[PDB]
């Protein structure tokens, strides 16, 4: 890369430019220790692109049974063949349709299942795990990954990467919907965008704009000609309780009958649309990071940080959990 790094979100987000640069840790840990997310671009240039095509997954694994989620209403489509998901990944009229006759925005639920990623896809496992940025943090045996070094007094993450596959959201009403709703995790994670399917183009730019993307990010589209995959909103762990207080208030306003100690973040049932994000800012002073994850971008999510994901197009992401020393406190089981 020409330069080692830059700053997105108007200076508030570190963006590293070379995913394999051995000096990345120096500037990374400076921002990581403050509870900030970090972005690393260019990972797709390190991978074998033919291994991350939706057509290839359908051909090699199409006969497996899976469950799908209708992102618009959270309904579950049970016990279908995974080729039913992949064959509609980019051709809309091949997609399963809802009772109202429209093609559904679908998320592939838990595939490969559990910890089976490595067993099912050995070559994809090697291709990714050998090219993850900041390897001392992210690799299973990295010197700064405590995942395999902590006693049972800490919540320890399951093994192997996960794959997250979902169609892109389309309409203006979809703008209030999430691919993955707001929640937090007790460990750190890195999430890599390995494929974006770009066949609506007007609503994508509008969604990015209303999502509060910065102008440098928008220039990655119009000048850099990069493919935007998903819109993230990430909030600092220290603001989690204020977010809960907002979502308890809104829930009551909407007639939900919840006990006063209800945890709407763990519930994973909310997506902060433009109205709620503006309200979170005006009434609680909480500001987040609005991140557009492009092809090859690796999003680093700090433990305890609430975060939500909104697919702009159909995406294939792969994520790996790890436990950094900076944030090990978030998986400790005692107060
Ligand atoms: O912590 C997370 C971050 C992003 C995602 C995700 N990435 N693309 N689509 N969904 C996700 C999915 C399930 C569980 N946790 C997740
Ligand atoms: Cl490292
Ligand atoms: Mn998660």
Keywords:
335 residues; Jelly Rolls; 10-stranded mixed beta sheet; 4-stranded antiparallel beta sheet; 25% helix; globular; binds 5-(1~{H}-1,2,3,4-tetrazol-5-yl)quinolin-8-ol; binds manganese (II) ion; Lysine-specific demethylase 3B
Short description:
With 335 residues, this protein is of the alpha+beta class.
Describe this structure in words.
This protein has a 10-stranded mixed sheet with strand order 1-2-3-12-9-14-7-6-4-5. The chain has a 4-stranded antiparallel sheet with strand order 8-13-10-11. It has one domain: Sandwich (Jelly Rolls), CATH 2.60.120. It contains 11 helices and 14 strands. The protein is of the alpha+beta class and 335 residues long. Strand 2, helix 1 (24-32) and strand 3 form a beta-alpha-beta unit. It binds 5-(1~{H}-1,2,3,4-tetrazol-5-yl)quinolin-8-ol (JX8), chloride ion and manganese (II) ion. Manganese (II) ion binds at residues 183, 185. It is found in: Nucleus. This is Lysine-specific demethylase 3B. Fe cation binds at residues 183, 185, 307.
The proportion of strand residues reads: 15-25%
Could you state the CATH homologous superfamily? Cupin
**How many helix segments?**
11
Q: What can be said about the biggest beta sheet?
A: 10 strands, mixed
Radius of gyration: 19 Å
Bound molecules: 5-(1~{H}-1,2,3,4-tetrazol-5-yl)quinolin-8-ol, chloride ion, manganese (II) ion
The helix/strand order is: EEHEHEEHEHHHEEEHHEHHHEEEE
Task: Tell me the structural class.
Answer: alpha+beta
């Amino acid at each position: 890369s020409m330069t080692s790094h830059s700053w997105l979100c108007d200076g508030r987000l570190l963006c590293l430019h070379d995913p394999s640069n051995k000096n990345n840790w120096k500037i990374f840990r400076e921002c990581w220790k403050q509870g900030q997310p970090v972005l690393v671009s260019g990972v797709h240039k390190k991978l074998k692109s033919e291994l991350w095509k939706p057509e290839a997954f359908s051909q090699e694994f199409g006969d497996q049974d899976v469950d799908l989620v209708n992102c618009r209403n959270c309904a579950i489509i049970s016990d279908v063949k995974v080729r039913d998901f992949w064959d509609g990944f980019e051709i809309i009229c091949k997609r399963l349709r809802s009772e109202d006759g429209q093609p559904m925005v679908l998320k592939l639920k838990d595939w490969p299942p559990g910890e089976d990623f490595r067993d099912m896809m050995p070559t994809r496992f090697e291709d990714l795990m050998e090219n993850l940025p900041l390897p001392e943090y992210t690799k299973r045996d990295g010197r700064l990954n405590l995942a395999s070094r902590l006693p049972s007094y800490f919540v320890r993450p399951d093994l192997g990467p996960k794959m997250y596959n979902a169609y892109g959201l389309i309409t203006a009403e979809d703008r209030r919907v999430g691919t993955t709703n707001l929640h937090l995790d007790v460990s750190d994670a890195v999430n890599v965008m390995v494929y974006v399917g770009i066949p609506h183009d007007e609503e994508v730019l509008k969604t990015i704009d209303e999502g509060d993307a910065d102008e440098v990010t928008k220039q990655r589209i119009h000048d850099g000609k990069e493919k935007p995959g998903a819109l993230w909103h990430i909030y600092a762990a220290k603001d989690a309780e204020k977010i809960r207080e907002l979502l308890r208030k809104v829930g009551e306003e909407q007639g939900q009958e919840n006990p006063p100690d209800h945890d709407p973040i763990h519930d994973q049932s909310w997506y902060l649309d433009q109205t709620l994000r503006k309200r979170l800012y005006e009434e609680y002073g909480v500001q987040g990071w609005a991140i557009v994850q492009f092809l090859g971008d690796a999003v680093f999510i700090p433990a305890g940080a609430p975060h939500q994901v909104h697919n702009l197009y159909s995406c294939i992401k792969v994520a790996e959990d790890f436990v950094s020393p900076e944030h090990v406190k978030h998986c400790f089981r005692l107060t």
